Design an enzyme around this catalytic site. Sequence first.
Site, PDB file in Angstrom:
ATOM      1  N   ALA A 159     -10.871   8.463   1.810  1.00 55.74           N
ATOM      2  CA  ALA A 159     -11.675   9.767   1.972  1.00 55.74           C
ATOM      3  C   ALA A 159     -11.253  10.023   3.555  1.00 55.74           C
ATOM      4  O   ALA A 159     -11.107  11.163   3.780  1.00 55.74           O
ATOM      5  CB  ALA A 159     -13.053   9.305   1.751  1.00 55.74           C
ATOM      6  N   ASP A 216     -11.625  -7.965   6.649  1.00 55.23           N
ATOM      7  CA  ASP A 216     -11.207  -7.759   5.482  1.00 55.23           C
ATOM      8  C   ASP A 216      -9.932  -8.320   5.140  1.00 55.23           C
ATOM      9  O   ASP A 216      -8.902  -7.655   4.808  1.00 55.23           O
ATOM     10  CB  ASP A 216     -11.143  -6.308   5.331  1.00 55.23           C
ATOM     11  N   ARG A 246      -4.236  -7.262  -0.367  1.00 50.51           N
ATOM     12  CA  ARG A 246      -4.125  -5.777  -0.193  1.00 50.51           C
ATOM     13  C   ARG A 246      -3.554  -5.363   1.485  1.00 50.51           C
ATOM     14  O   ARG A 246      -2.960  -4.506   1.509  1.00 50.51           O
ATOM     15  CB  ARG A 246      -4.965  -5.145  -0.776  1.00 50.51           C
ATOM     16  N   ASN A 247      -3.988  -6.460   2.402  1.00 49.76           N
ATOM     17  CA  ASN A 247      -4.000  -6.144   3.801  1.00 49.76           C
ATOM     18  C   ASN A 247      -2.971  -7.019   4.342  1.00 49.76           C
ATOM     19  O   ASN A 247      -3.272  -7.210   5.669  1.00 49.76           O
ATOM     20  CB  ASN A 247      -5.395  -6.194   4.207  1.00 49.76           C
ATOM     21  N   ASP A 252      -4.852  -3.803   9.116  1.00 47.66           N
ATOM     22  CA  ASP A 252      -6.205  -3.273   8.953  1.00 47.66           C
ATOM     23  C   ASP A 252      -6.319  -1.979   8.240  1.00 47.66           C
ATOM     24  O   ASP A 252      -5.343  -1.068   8.450  1.00 47.66           O
ATOM     25  CB  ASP A 252      -7.055  -2.915  10.074  1.00 47.66           C
TER      26      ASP A 252
HETATM   27  C1  LIG Z   1      -1.837   0.983   7.080  1.00 44.83           C
HETATM   28  C2  LIG Z   1      -1.565   0.266   5.879  1.00 44.83           C
HETATM   29  C3  LIG Z   1      -0.100   0.393   5.155  1.00 44.83           C
HETATM   30  N1  LIG Z   1       0.781   0.237   6.195  1.00 44.83           N
HETATM   31  C4  LIG Z   1       2.071   0.369   5.880  1.00 44.83           C
HETATM   32  C5  LIG Z   1       3.387   0.119   6.619  1.00 44.83           C
HETATM   33  N2  LIG Z   1       3.039   0.083   8.354  1.00 44.83           N
HETATM   34  O1  LIG Z   1       4.371  -0.047   6.482  1.00 44.83           O
HETATM   35  C6  LIG Z   1       2.409   0.935   4.437  1.00 44.83           C
HETATM   36  N3  LIG Z   1       1.220   1.244   3.675  1.00 44.83           N
HETATM   37  C7  LIG Z   1       0.115   1.067   4.091  1.00 44.83           C
HETATM   38  N4  LIG Z   1      -0.810   1.216   3.176  1.00 44.83           N
HETATM   39  C8  LIG Z   1      -1.489   0.672   1.774  1.00 44.83           C
HETATM   40  C9  LIG Z   1      -0.049   0.285   1.043  1.00 44.83           C
HETATM   41  C10 LIG Z   1      -0.176   0.064  -0.359  1.00 44.83           C
HETATM   42  N5  LIG Z   1      -0.886   0.694  -1.084  1.00 44.83           N
HETATM   43  C11 LIG Z   1      -0.725   0.824  -2.157  1.00 44.83           C
HETATM   44  C12 LIG Z   1      -0.680   1.922  -2.838  1.00 44.83           C
HETATM   45  O2  LIG Z   1       0.508   2.773  -2.047  1.00 44.83           O
HETATM   46  C13 LIG Z   1       1.605   2.509  -2.259  1.00 44.83           C
HETATM   47  C14 LIG Z   1       2.226   2.411  -0.698  1.00 44.83           C
HETATM   48  O3  LIG Z   1       3.574   2.235  -0.753  1.00 44.83           O
HETATM   49  C15 LIG Z   1       4.331   1.770   0.211  1.00 44.83           C
HETATM   50  C16 LIG Z   1       3.510   1.810   1.540  1.00 44.83           C
HETATM   51  C17 LIG Z   1       4.400   1.166   2.684  1.00 44.83           C
HETATM   52  C18 LIG Z   1       5.521   0.393   2.441  1.00 44.83           C
HETATM   53  C19 LIG Z   1       6.102   0.045   1.207  1.00 44.83           C
HETATM   54  C20 LIG Z   1       5.418   0.968   0.134  1.00 44.83           C
HETATM   55  N6  LIG Z   1       5.982   0.723  -1.200  1.00 44.83           N
HETATM   56  C21 LIG Z   1       6.358   1.711  -2.355  1.00 44.83           C
HETATM   57  C22 LIG Z   1       7.175   1.379  -3.376  1.00 44.83           C
HETATM   58  O4  LIG Z   1       8.117   0.583  -2.902  1.00 44.83           O
HETATM   59  C23 LIG Z   1       7.524  -0.727  -2.788  1.00 44.83           C
HETATM   60  C24 LIG Z   1       6.568  -0.704  -1.681  1.00 44.83           C
HETATM   61  N7  LIG Z   1       3.800   1.257   3.982  1.00 44.83           N
HETATM   62  C25 LIG Z   1      -2.328   0.925  -0.582  1.00 44.83           C
HETATM   63  C26 LIG Z   1      -2.370   1.143   1.063  1.00 44.83           C
END
Ligand SMILES: CCc1nc(C(N)=O)c2nc1NC1CCN(CCOCCOc3cc(ccc3N3CCOCC3)N2)CC1
Length: 304
Positions: free
Chosen positions: A48, A171, A175-176, A189
């Site tokens: 959100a 947290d 997932r983190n 985070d």
């Molecule tokens: C700050 C948090 C963060 N950091 C980073 C980073 N610094 O890399 C980052 N995603 C996030 N958010 C999270 C990620 C996970 N999701 C789940 C659903 O969303 C899919 C995201 O998909 C990705 C996002 C990333 C890498 C890889 C993917 N894949 C896509 C398909 O192939 C395999 C992996 N990158 C929730 C929020």
Amino acid sequence: ESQLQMVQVTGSSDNEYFYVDFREYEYDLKWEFPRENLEFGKVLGSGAFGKVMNATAYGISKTGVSIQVAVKMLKEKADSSEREALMSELKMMTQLGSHENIVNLLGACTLSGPIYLIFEYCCYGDLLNYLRSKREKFSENVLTFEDLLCFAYQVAKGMEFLEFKSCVHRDLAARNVLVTHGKVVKICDFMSDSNYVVRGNARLPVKWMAPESLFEGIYTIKSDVWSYGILLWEIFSLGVNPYPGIPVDANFYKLIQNGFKMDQPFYATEEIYIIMQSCWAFDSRKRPSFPNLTSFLGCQLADA
Ligand SMILES: CCc1nc(C(N)=O)c2nc1NC1CCN(CCOCCOc3cc(ccc3N3CCOCC3)N2)CC1
């Protein structure tokens, strides 16, 4: 609000502490980046408040290549109160310094317009989705058991680094934890997710929370050890919902306060199930430190 906060302890017992607000501190300008060199990507996650996208940053590394990144930013149609709260997370992250097991901060765009904060890129995603995806091809491109053990050691020395810097991560969960090149993982985070209960202005990951957090709001370095044990269960389960089958309700609160502990997961040795039970001690004084979990696992791997 940022689920990772820095604390200053003001006594001996667990609740004698207070958090640090950077709203009055000044922001170091050497992290400032120009938006000219941010070549975008696809949304990678948006709740959100805000989102984080893929991006491409020419000339942002030491040498200078593309080096894809993730960029956290607002989208509340240019808000006010929510903006300075992000500035203070920036101020904190800038002073945390780099560790090999933390999703580190690489830059930010401040007066450049709407606030941007640029983090490292972990291409393989969060550990939860990474673990569950390889349930098919688990074997006893596809992972060993030393993976399960190396993952546990890296998150440990990461939390060990957050303790040295006098921080607590409120947290810690699969997932983190995010996987990057060569089976290395880094703690990071951040309302359609079954894992967080909303209770007031707080959003709580109930099944990961230590009893002193569920019942009196205390968050200490030892509360993270409790969550770490839950994550330990997440790893050696290949990533199924902790306390599987039991819903988050009033009955679940009576569960934790009466001493419920999860069973040994399938892919766990008898040894590291003991370590899980240590973190799930009710008395937080009876819980293992994050230093002690340097050797107790970094050795379990060398035998593999
Ligand atoms: C700050 C948090 C963060 N950091 C980073 C980073 N610094 O890399 C980052 N995603 C996030 N958010 C999270 C990620 C996970 N999701 C789940 C659903 O969303 C899919 C995201 O998909 C990705 C996002 C990333 C890498 C890889 C993917 N894949 C896509 C398909 O192939 C395999 C992996 N990158 C929730 C929020």
